[PDB]
Amino acid sequence: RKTYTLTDYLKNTYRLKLYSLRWISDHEYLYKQENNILVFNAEYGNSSVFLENSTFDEFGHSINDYSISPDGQFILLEYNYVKQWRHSYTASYDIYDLNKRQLITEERIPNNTQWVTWSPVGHKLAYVWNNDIYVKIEPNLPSYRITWTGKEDIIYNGITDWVYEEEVFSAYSALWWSPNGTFLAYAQFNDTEVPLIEYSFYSDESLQYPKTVRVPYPKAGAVNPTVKFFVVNTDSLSSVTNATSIQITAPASMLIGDHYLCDVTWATQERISLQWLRRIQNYSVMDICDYDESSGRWNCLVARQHIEMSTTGWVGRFRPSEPHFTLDGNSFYKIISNEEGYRHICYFQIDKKDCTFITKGTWEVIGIEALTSDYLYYISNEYKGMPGGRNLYKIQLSDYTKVTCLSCELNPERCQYYSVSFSKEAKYYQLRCSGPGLPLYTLHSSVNDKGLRVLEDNSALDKMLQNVQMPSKKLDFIILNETKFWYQMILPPHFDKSKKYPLLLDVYAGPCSQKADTVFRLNWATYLASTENIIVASFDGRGSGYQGDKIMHAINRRLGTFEVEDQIEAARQFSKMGFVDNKRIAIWGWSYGGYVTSMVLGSGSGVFKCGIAVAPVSRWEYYDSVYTERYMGLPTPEDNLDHYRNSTVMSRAENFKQVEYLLIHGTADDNVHFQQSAQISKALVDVGVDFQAMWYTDEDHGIASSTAHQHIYTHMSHFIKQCFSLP
Template sequence: MDAESADCKLSWSELKNVVTDLRRQLSSLSTMVPTNVSFRQLHDGRTRIYFLSTPQNGWESTLLFADVPNENPNASLTLQWHCVIESNFPTVSASIRYSREEQLLWERKRLATWGINWYEIHSASGKIVFPANSSLFQCIDNGYSAGPLFPTKLRISTASGAKLNPQICPSNPDLVAYICNQDIWVAHTVSGCNERLTYAHKGGRNLADDPLCAGVPSYVMQEEFSRYQGYWWQPTCALGVYRILYEEIDDGDVKIFCFPSSQSDPSGEVEEFRFPRAGCANSKSYLKLIEFRISDTQQITDIVMLELQFSVNTLFPWTEYIVRAGWTPDSEYIWVQLLDRRQKHLELVLLSLSNFTEVLPMYDEGTNSDIGNPMVQVIYAEESCAWVNVHDLLVFLPGASDNQVQFIWASEETGFRHLYLVTAQLMPYTNGISEPMDHVSLHPKLLQKVALTHGDWEVLAQDIWVDVEREVVYFMGLRETVLEKHLYVVSLRRPGEVRLLTRTGYSYQCDFNDECSMLVTVYSNIENIPACQVFKVTHTDWTVEGVQLTPLGYLLESGPPLNKKYCPDLFTHTIESGHTLYAMVFKPHGFQQGKQYPTILNVYGGPEVQLVSNAFKGMRQLRMHMLAARGYCVVAIDSRGSQHRGIEFESYLRGRMGTVELVDQVEVLKWLASSLGYVDLRRVAIHGWSYGGYLSLMGLVQHPDVFKLAIAGAPVTNWMLYDTGYTERYMDLPENNQQGYDEGSVLNYINKFPEEENRLLIIHGLIDENVHFYHTSQLINSMVKAGKPYQLQIYPNERHSLRHLDASKHYETTLLSFLQNHL
């Protein structure tokens, strides 16, 4: 289909065929990029790399491996992919009706619903565990097997309900913990012994009477803080005692909402969800500990449930969220990150194991000598005038002297996220009789805090890799340009000396093995589809200049250059405020110089997202490519408030979402039109999903002279209806910013929507549990009362993402039809 197609009116049936044809044509943009990479050293010195991808001629994701030879590195070698699992293993079954818990986990993690989308491997033993078909499966890769393995189902709980989030015990791979029906279970995979460890959830049909769960983070923790883990194995087993730290969630104060059940549910009943709207009660979170032993007959015995003597909420009454938790590598301490409700104050706290007890003691005078010194110590505190961006950049280092702890941490105190080497003092251990509060320190005692990186650029929030022996830290950052993610290294011995390890002109994703001796990197740019290369990491000396990357081969070679019509152009513009903004423009495929084209502004515009970068725009941008193929010019702009530009740039939206974003979008759009000459400003549609759907509505209200049409997908219409974690971070609590909530509500601008027909199309999944359909129903109810025209497309069986192929194709046909008929 060429660019002339935009001016050619097609019937619905013809457009359906166009969508099918375009999906087939655009399949060349789909790449089998390895994800979820793990490393394992084999007996003969080879390194085996495990990853998830889609094998050639396959259609669903599976677990694969490639072996890296231990000698004679060959930079041009293409490493052979092998299936870990037999190809006829049924990862998808038509007879399986997936549980709501599985569906919601896929939504929170943004995972695909077909094939294997997650696995866990125990490197020393080769044991692999993964969820599929609502159950758990295992296999053992001994490193010698010539063919693929056929997994066996774990002998686990016979209780109904999906088995989710399995974790192999680090010190004993025979033990696998998992979640079933909102509680933690553990299985001994050799003896077949299964034990339910927690009894928080009753499993009743009445949600109101069953508010507790164990090992499962709250909705807000998963959706807004990207923590999907609610229990943590102790790294080592001491004296035969296994321990699991876990989080118990009490949703009793969180309001219940009812949605229509999915169409795949034959009961036709409503689904109940707990959802904390802005300003309302959140889930309560409690840290607890389980201890158990393994008998001589490999049975799970001596299960003990322990609770904190000093609860987090007692010592830190300001705490609203436990955003991160885990164990120190030596298993001596539990660490937690605590965040207040307004998300401006965060503390990193160490808890000794003696904080946990079976029975809360009564502290009468003279009876507290066997408390066991339950140390509670704040080792770091963070403040922000905007908000604290929670990250995963925390590594505890071994070898600190007595009564000290040393760790690598990231802070945005300079306005940009950077790495710091922190040394904090711990309270001395005493054996004498003492008061309980003698072992509580609520103020960090920092002995040293050294900036490892600095500058007006950002260290990315997800991964750092520390080579403890050589005292170097590898990390991802944006020092060269905000448009490219690169790998860097810095030495703990020479802080501030940062060395770039990857090539400019590309954007990278990286994974290291535990020893930091091997690296897998996926890289691409705007014109080249992703390639995946393996490198050996060596050192000529202890400095960052001594780090050497030797190519060992490719997991995925870069393909031939794509047709330029699939490659958008990148643009830079300095707006009136003095800020530099970036834009991306997809030309119509049949582009002709001197002609103006109808244009789609594809908008997101909210925080935590960057649309424009020098990375390949593949199937994730399917609809942008589809529109360009149909003869539309497609524009995407990262306005102030977007990600990776520092806290000041991001906080442009603070307290005033929906009132300022479109000023930047329109200014850059008009600049592009005047600079390029082929953007037809008389025919511009604004289209987006979620926050982008919200701004699409606001665009038609605030700039009806600029946007002829708006297509709003799953739009927020009133921030009072959205969740606490996201909304309050950027808008504060409603009681502190009522004006901002009022001005940011689409519902307060109904009279400003145009009177002309066919200018507004709203699209929403009926069972969307993220942006509830109630947002749209409130909007259309107000539109009806005001006599305003609109079109509405509902997908009864879809949540926030359109996951079914038939719904996606119907939506794309609807989009093309609306645009061709009215733009």
């Protein structure tokens, strides 16, 4: 009988099916099938072919992706796609007129465009090229240039610099249409005095001299980019006169020093919400800015600011939370940490003090998913007090005591982890179950929360998997210091608690992380358990999220401490359970996981025979400002420098003579710079410790090229097997 093998993982023998749909109104969505784009009707479920797979057979370009305008009239073809960072890329674009059934060859969008976006209604375009913003009112018309200051690596108009892309917006885009399509609001980043990270890129053999890449990248404590915010009136664009961009300045309480622009949210046609964050991330201000027909300006009455401070930690999970505005724009809801340090939905009224908590309890709201005049819909982990579960809920605005679980009972044994996607106005929603069973995609009508139809049930995979000796997953908790800390175990098939198993501790452990959940996954761990009979465990210790601030904030200004400790204690706890061979306990982790793995291996606890660290952080000054300073403050004598210095991997090099260690890193890693591992190895060498290593030429933090991905997991499997004396 067979098992889930390494080749299965690497080669994708058993594929998860999905159902990715694009709502295009209050009752229809688009859906790709045989590369035919179909349009569906939510209420009745009937469909027709919106775009035939054949339409562009004569395009003479492989088509990367497509974007239909809000009004159906036009579709954007994305080709020549070249990836930059986690979100950024370049591409060439073409516009196809749907009514005329024709490619547009007039006033085309330039190659090497950095970003493109339809207006939210109609068919207007905004795009960025050479760091400047252009606007096309109609596809076949000359575009209007909005900014002239754009300049590679120095001035970014309408797009983010490296650190804004990665740590702040989670996007390349830095443009925001008003609901109307009347205003285009945008940010400008100035990286003039941001230092450059520099590394070699070797490329194809034929390249004689290696390239040096140079990326403005503020390390902890370094000079940060600066930011401005502008709003342009798209209706009044001259062909003679330049576009008059109106600037909105950050509150004076932010201007006093370094700060970030961290959220942009149109409330109405004439109200924009701006959240700003001090470089010290325990203080942020939400501005409410109104447009003035008479002056054409925008004013943010100081009196109506909204202020957030934290004292236990930083602000928000990873950032101040997103505001969700009631349609009229005079109030909003947003997730806020209550007085017991739990994250719950708060109701805010413009021009009124405080806010009002509409939810409470020892559990947390994960997200606000939709808002109607009667209901607010959110995801939380309240069901069964499982912090690693997700369920959809709705709360009646006219009586907060009335909360209905929409997903809890749909199928209580297969589905414990949901995400949701609502139609415009939310007449329908698509529920997406991620586990613990096979993923299940279903459609529902809001009116009386009625199941309409099943979209995808992964029955095809279920069948295949029935023929395989698959692992099972235990999700549970242990109690330390009278506190529940949750963990999971992927257990080998025909598990026998009277046998001894080798145990590999799979670690991430970064602030607000969660490695114990109810999600179904087919990954490297599946293979280790199925084929090699290894228990793969993870554990959520202090620092972990979704369980309140008392736990999440335990790591405030003290990274590489409690979260490192707790991993070690959890492994102590796992052995005491009678089915673990304490002579064979390993540990591995990527990114922040590689750091923690390293710190543990270097702790000298003698609990771990061996471990692997992939692209780990080695010391916090090496990593980016926005992320690092959030948890560690500044590395100055007046601030937290002492703990910056007491928390390096290097400083533990001696203890590595107790373990077998494998360090791996990509040479073109723009994120966790190869530097971080280069310093780890030099410290190990300098102190006489043997270890194993592997670099990946031209791979970034993802090491995700098809060949490298395969190569690394093959390399690590060999290492773990050796370590465990496995055949």
